Amino acid sequence: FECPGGRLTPQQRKDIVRQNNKFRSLLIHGKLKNRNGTYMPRGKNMLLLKWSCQLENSAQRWANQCVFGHSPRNQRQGIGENVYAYWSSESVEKLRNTAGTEAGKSWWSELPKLYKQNPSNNLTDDVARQGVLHFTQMAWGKTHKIGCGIATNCDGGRTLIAICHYSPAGNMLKELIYELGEPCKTDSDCNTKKCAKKSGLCRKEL
Ligand SMILES: *[C@@H]1O[C@H](CO)[C@@H](O[C@@H]2O[C@H](CO)[C@@H](O[C@@H]3O[C@H](CO)[C@@H](O)[C@H](O)[C@@H]3O)[C@H](O)[C@H]2NC(C)=O)[C@H](O[C@@H]2O[C@@H](C)[C@@H](O)[C@@H](O)[C@@H]2O)[C@H]1NC(C)=O
Ligand SMILES: *[C@@H]1O[C@H](CO)[C@@H](O)[C@H](O[C@@H]2O[C@@H](C)[C@@H](O)[C@@H](O)[C@@H]2O)[C@H]1NC(C)=O
């Protein structure tokens, strides 16, 4: 959680990772409702997210622009991107320390508010069209790397922007968001061959 030249604190990085992994674990344990009021299906092989300084560096470069939008495609090759902003009429400095976790709650909130019952867990065109792509990237079983950048100087210090980058990039159409199964109990349950038993998520390093 130490990233040379970074503008985040170690704690911010940890809070972001711990929150997103908690979400993932709650999800694969069947504890989270979709828009229809029905629990999402239990999952297996959901990777445990690791912080990547490389990802933070690209996300931070974009956050520094103070633009509420995506970075250009050619700077996002192989990489997912989620964008969050908070617009105040006063200073946002007090919001910096929870920027990442507020952003994760906002992206993640797509599940209960916009994500209709999808039993196959397949990311079809009709599922994608709902605007659940921020949530689906945070939930993407194959993604295992996350890095985020934050700007609080935007609009005279009155706008907060948080940018998170994910690798590998999630949201490939016609692939499942995550595999249907049981959370890992032992290493051999995981295709990566290492299981985080407390969370039921599979470990994948870097
Ligand atoms: C997610 O859901 C989509 C929509 O059903 C799956 O794609 C569909 O796969 C079917 C076969 O599993 C395709 O059927 C074929 O249709 C052609 C058209 O003539 C026939 O010639 C052929 O013999 C089959 O009957 C179906 O067309 C296809 N849907 C579309 C519009 O693409 C998808 O399955 C996955 O993607 C497809 C493209 C293949 O790679 C499948 O093997 C693969 O499982 C579902 N995704 C997942 C991960 O389940
Ligand atoms: C989730 O809620 C929506 C809106 O209330 C319903 O349309 C879904 O049931 C639907 O059943 C038919 C009409 C068809 O639209 C189907 O695609 C939907 O599933 C409901 N989902 C379920 C599975 O009950």
Residue from 132, 107, 120 nearest 35 by CA: 132
Asked if 170 and 76 count as a contact pair (C-beta separation under 8 A), the reply is no
Query: Which segments within 154-204 are labelled E, that is strand?
Result: 159-167, 179-180, 195-196, 201-202
Give the C-alpha separation, 111 to 190, whole Å. 25
Q: Which amino acid is located at 205 in the chain?
A: E
Give the C-alpha separation, 49 to 46, whole Å. 9
Experimental method: X-ray
Closest Cα to atom 16, ligand 2: which residue?
117
Distance 130 CA to ligand 1 centre (A): 21
Distance 39 CA to ligand 2 centre (A): 15
Atom of ligand 2 nearest to the CA of 116: 1
All structural domains of the chain with their residue ranges: 1-206
Asked if 200 and 31 count as a contact pair (C-beta separation under 8 A), the reply is no
Give 86's contacts (C-beta < 8 A, 6+ positions apart): 92, 95, 99, 102, 159, 160
Q: Which amino acid is located at 143 in the chain?
A: T
Distance 174 CA to ligand 1 centre (A): 8
Atom of ligand 1 nearest to the CA of 175: 48
Neighbours of 192 (CB within 10 A): 15
Closest Cα to atom 28, ligand 1: which residue?
174
Give 36's contacts (C-beta < 8 A, 6+ positions apart): 116, 117
Q: Which amino acid is located at 174 in the chain?
A: K
- In this structure, the dihedral spanned by the alpha carbons of residues 170, 175, 179 and 180, taken in order and rounded to 10 degrees, is 140
Give 51's contacts (C-beta < 8 A, 6+ positions apart): 1, 3, 13, 14, 16, 17, 145, 146, 147
Please report which helix (H) or strand (E) contains residue 148, including its range: strand 145-153
HSE, CB side, 13 Å, CA atoms: give it for residue 158. Answer: 5
Neighbours of 78 (CB within 10 A): 7
- Torsional sign, CA 104, 7, 205, 196: negative
Give the C-alpha separation, 27 to 24, whole Å. 5
Helix ranges restricted to H, 36-132: 53-63, 99-108, 110-114, 125-128
Residue from 201, 148, 167 nearest 12 by CA: 148
Asked if 117 and 34 count as a contact pair (C-beta separation under 8 A), the reply is yes
Closest Cα to atom 11, ligand 2: which residue?
117
Q: For this experimental structure, what is the resolution in angstroms?
A: 2.2
Residue from 206, 205, 202 nearest 48 by CA: 202
